[PDB]
């Protein structure tokens, strides 16, 4: 069968979730149907799949892959965690959905890294990312290895910096720089919008996060005050990839289709359509 | 011993003659480390191609030495005999360059700045990228926003831009209908080599040179010239192996690990940034 369960996760501009037109119950314009499971209450795990609509950079990629690779799909938003983290030896998030065969693939702002590649197969990266550092203009930070980050209590007052936990960026910091990691947790941000407000109002000195999302936010920042250090410099370069089950039969055609999109200039165009910044 | 094919492409692979005793001259990087060099056999120049030992080093050689140590394999390096990266040419098309050597078994691994693309991926296995690729623009220390700048999109003789004749860039531009206007403008000004095109930017004869971003950032490390604008037509360089290779999984995992622990960034700072 060519009808595939596919999981995603909202993260603008890669995946943007909108309410469906209630009269028509049909998704239009550049959006596709996507459902989200929402609990009735806090006593039981009973819930309902809410019909919603999804659009964005990754959704246009999914639509093109559906056409060229020849499949249909049932797109759903993950609700057990977010991108993917191994908790007590059990992957949650989009990675977990693929590992435990609830989704044939995961399409979204899903970072390729080594530990995830041990449990899923990734397509070719379809957009470059990594780790960047966002600051308010003028804050001086040489890079991730700035000793303001590495040995923060060498400085008085110490640098205030954080990430959104449980994703690939925290995993990288935790693995590479243990003292820096344990220090940052007190500055953990609940999400990107929280972090950006914390930066703009001077409650945080730096926000360390996915490079593609940070550089998209810098390009849109009102007043162009929030910038990524270097000039959009990317540490630990990697990419977003489609996650597939290990040994998935779909990987080859997905790979070739994504590279065809590159070869025909369509990825360049998608990049310009969704990720361009005023700043 | 895995047979590694590579190609001369600075700053990823430098190729120099051996010293008079057949060894490689001891040299050091900007960071003060010794340059690791390997002997790579290959042609010297309708003339006979005498294959001799030469000295190979750079980004890609550093990566090979890491991979070889990390994955516990031995290797011998040679330079591709016909000097080409690898395109399908008709005699029933056949792959030339490093692609043909890999597919014919003259090589077991391509370790080179080999651009990942659909045509090659139909035939061989690429790793996850060891370096992300794109085009940028080289100019005199001159603002151009990138591929969508009005002085590129609406060309005139007042702002001359070009690439290398018959290069992958030349071919790429010819292929996209939407680049027709830029292609015809470049066609009137394309240079025979990158070196000549870069010299023409210095001498105010060429206002902008469209070329590989890694090479051009390597060039801006001399500086009267600069790279400018957003990268465009991005992809990556990968290690190339045959579909059946028992190495491809661990090669690609090792590349991810080297990006994640900063090894790859160190390579960028040794060979590309300065
Ligand atoms: O088109 C060329 N060379 C060429 C020069 C003169 C005439 C014909 C061809 N090189 C490109 C493309 C090449 C590849 O994967 O085929 N990789 C690759 C890697 C790096 Cl680092 C820099 C470049 Cl430019 C390139
Ligand atoms: N894209 C990241 C989430 C954000 C981050 O941790 O940088 C991931 O796949 O985990």
UniProtKB/Swiss-Prot annotation, chain A:
The chain holds residues 403 to 800 of 1464 of the full protein. It comes from the Eukaryota. L-glutamate binds at residues 109, 111, 116, 168-169, 210. Heterotetramer. Forms heterotetrameric channels composed of two GluN1/zeta subunits (GRIN1), and two identical GluN2/epsilon subunits (GRIN2A, GRIN2B, GRIN2C or GRIN2D) or GluN3 subunits (GRIN3A or GRIN3B) (in vitro). Can also form heterotetrameric channels that contain at least two GluN1 subunits and at least two different GluN2 subunits (or a combination of one GluN2 and one GluN3 subunits) (in vitro). In vivo, the subunit composition may depend on the expression levels of the different subunits. Found in a complex with GRIN1, GRIN3A and PPP2CB. Found in a complex with GRIN1 and GRIN3B. Changing residue 14 to A: Decreased sensitivity to glutamate. It is found in: Cell projection, Dendritic spine; Cell membrane; Synapse; Postsynaptic cell membrane. Contains an N-terminal domain, a ligand-binding domain and a transmembrane domain. Agonist binding to the extracellular ligand-binding domains triggers channel gating. Detected in brain cortex, olfactory bulb, hippocampus including the dentate gyrus, striatum, thalamus, superior colliculus, inferior colliculus, midbrain and cerebellum (at protein level). Detected in brain cortex, hypothalamus and cerebellum. This is Glutamate receptor ionotropic, NMDA 2A. Residues 140-279 are extracellular. Glycans are attached at residues 41-42, 166. Belongs to the glutamate-gated ion channel (TC 1.A.10.1) family. NR2A/GRIN2A subfamily. Disulfide bonds join 27-53, 34-54, 224-279. Component of N-methyl-D-aspartate (NMDA) receptors (NMDARs) that function as heterotetrameric, ligand-gated cation channels with high calcium permeability and voltage-dependent block by Mg(2+). NMDARs participate in synaptic plasticity for learning and memory formation by contributing to the slow phase of excitatory postsynaptic current, long-term synaptic potentiation, and learning.
Swiss-Prot record, chain B:
It is found in: Cell membrane; Postsynaptic cell membrane; Synaptic cell membrane; Postsynaptic density membrane. Glycans are attached at residues 44, 72, 154, 250. Glycine binds at residues 113, 115, 120, 168, 212. NMDA is probably regulated by C-terminal phosphorylation of an isoform of NR1 by PKC. Its phosphorylated state is influenced by the formation of the NMDAR-PPP2CB complex and the NMDAR channel activity. Disulfide bonds join 24-55, 40-56. Detected throughout the brain, in brain cortex, cerebellum, thalamus and olfactory bulb. It comes from the Eukaryota. Residues 143-274 are extracellular. Component of N-methyl-D-aspartate (NMDA) receptors (NMDARs) that function as heterotetrameric, ligand-gated cation channels with high calcium permeability and voltage-dependent block by Mg(2+). NMDARs participate in synaptic plasticity for learning and memory formation by contributing to the long-term potentiation (LTP). Channel activation requires binding of the neurotransmitter L-glutamate to the GluN2 subunit, glycine or D-serine binding to the GluN1 subunit, plus membrane depolarization to eliminate channel inhibition by Mg(2+). A hydrophobic region that gives rise to the prediction of a transmembrane span does not cross the membrane, but is part of a discontinuously helical region that dips into the membrane and is probably part of the pore and of the selectivity filter. Belongs to the glutamate-gated ion channel (TC 1.A.10.1) family. NR1/GRIN1 subfamily. Heterotetramer; the NMDAR subunits are modular and harbor tiered domains that function in concert to regulate opening and closing of the cation-selective ion channel pore. Forms heterotetrameric channels composed of two GluN1/zeta subunits (GRIN1), and two identical GluN2/epsilon subunits (GRIN2A, GRIN2B, GRIN2C or GRIN2D) or GluN3 subunits (GRIN3A or GRIN3B) (in vitro). Can also form heterotetrameric channels that contain at least two GluN1 subunits and at least two different GluN2 subunits (or a combination of one GluN2 and one GluN3 subunits) (in vitro). This is Glutamate receptor ionotropic, NMDA 1. It comes from Rattus norvegicus (Rat). The chain holds residues 397 to 795 of 938 of the full protein.
């Amino acid at each position: 069968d060519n009808h595939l369960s596919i999981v995603t996760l909202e993260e603008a501009p890669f995946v943007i979730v909108e309410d469906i037109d209630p009269l028509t119950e049909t998704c239009v314009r550049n959006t596709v149907p996507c459902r989200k499971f929402v609990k009735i209450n806090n006593s039981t795990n009973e819930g309902m799949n809410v019909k919603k609509c999804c659009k964005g950079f990754c959704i246009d990629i999914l639509k093109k892959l559906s056409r060229t690779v020849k499949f249909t799909y049932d797109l759903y938003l993950v609700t057990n965690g977010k991108h993917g983290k191994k908790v007590n030896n059990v992957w949650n998030g989009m990675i977990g959905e693929v590992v435990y065969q609830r989704a044939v693939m995961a399409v979204g702002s899903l970072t390729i890294n080594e530990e995830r590649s041990e449990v899923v197969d990734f397509s070719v990266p379809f957009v470059e990312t990594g780790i960047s550092v966002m600051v308010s203009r003028g804050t001086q930070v040489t890079g991730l290895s700035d000793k303001k980050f590495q040995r923060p209590h060498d400085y008085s007052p110490p640098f205030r910096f954080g990430t959104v936990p449980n994703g690939s960026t925290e995993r990288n910091i935790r693995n590479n720089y243990p003292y820096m990691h344990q220090y940052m947790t007190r500055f953990n941000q609940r999400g990107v919008e929280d972090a950006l407000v914390s930066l703009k109002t001077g409650k945080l000195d730096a926000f360390i996060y996915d490079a593609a999302v940070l550089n998209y936010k810098a390009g849109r920042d009102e007043g162009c005050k929030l910038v990524t250090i270097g000039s959009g410099y990317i540490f630990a370069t990697t990419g977003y990839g489609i996650a597939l089950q290990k040994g998935s039969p779909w990987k080859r055609q997905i790979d070739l289709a994504l590279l065809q999109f590159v070869g025909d200039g369509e990825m360049e165009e998608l990049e310009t359509l969704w990720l361009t910044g005023i700043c | 011993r895995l047979k590694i094919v590579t190609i001369h492409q600075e700053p990823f692979v430098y190729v120099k003659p051996t010293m008079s005793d057949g060894t490689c001259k001891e040299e050091f990087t900007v960071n003060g480390d010794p340059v690791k060099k390997v002997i790579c056999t290959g042609p010297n120049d309708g003339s006979p191609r005498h294959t001799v030992p030469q000295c190979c080093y750079g980004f890609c050689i550093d990566l090979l030495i890491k991979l070889a140590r990390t994955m516990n394999f031995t290797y011998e390096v040679h330079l591709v005999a016909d000097g080409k990266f690898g395109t399908q040419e008709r005699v029933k098309k056949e792959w030339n360059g490093m692609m043909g050597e890999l597919l014919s078994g003259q090589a077991d691994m391509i370790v080179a700045p080999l651009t990942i693309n659909n045509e090659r991926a139909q035939y061989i296995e690429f790793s996850k990228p060891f370096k992300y690729q794109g085009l940028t623009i080289l100019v005199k220390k001159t603002r151009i926003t990138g591929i969508n700048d009005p002085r590129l999109r609406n060309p005139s003789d007042k702002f001359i831009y070009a690439t290398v004749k018959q290069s992958s860039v030349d071919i790429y531009f010819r292929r996209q209908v939407e680049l027709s206007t830029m292609y015809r403008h470049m066609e009137k000004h394309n240079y025979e080599s990158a070196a000549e095109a870069i010299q023409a930017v210095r001498d105010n004869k060429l206002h902008a040179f469209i070329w590989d971003s890694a090479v051009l950032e390597f060039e801006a490390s001399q500086c009267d010239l600069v790279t400018t604008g957003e990268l465009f037509f991005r992809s990556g360089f990968g290690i190339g192996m045959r579909k059946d290779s028992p190495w491809k999984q661990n090669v690609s995992l090792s590349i991810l690990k080297s990006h994640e622990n900063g090894f790859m960034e160190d390579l960028d700072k040794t060979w590309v940034r300065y």
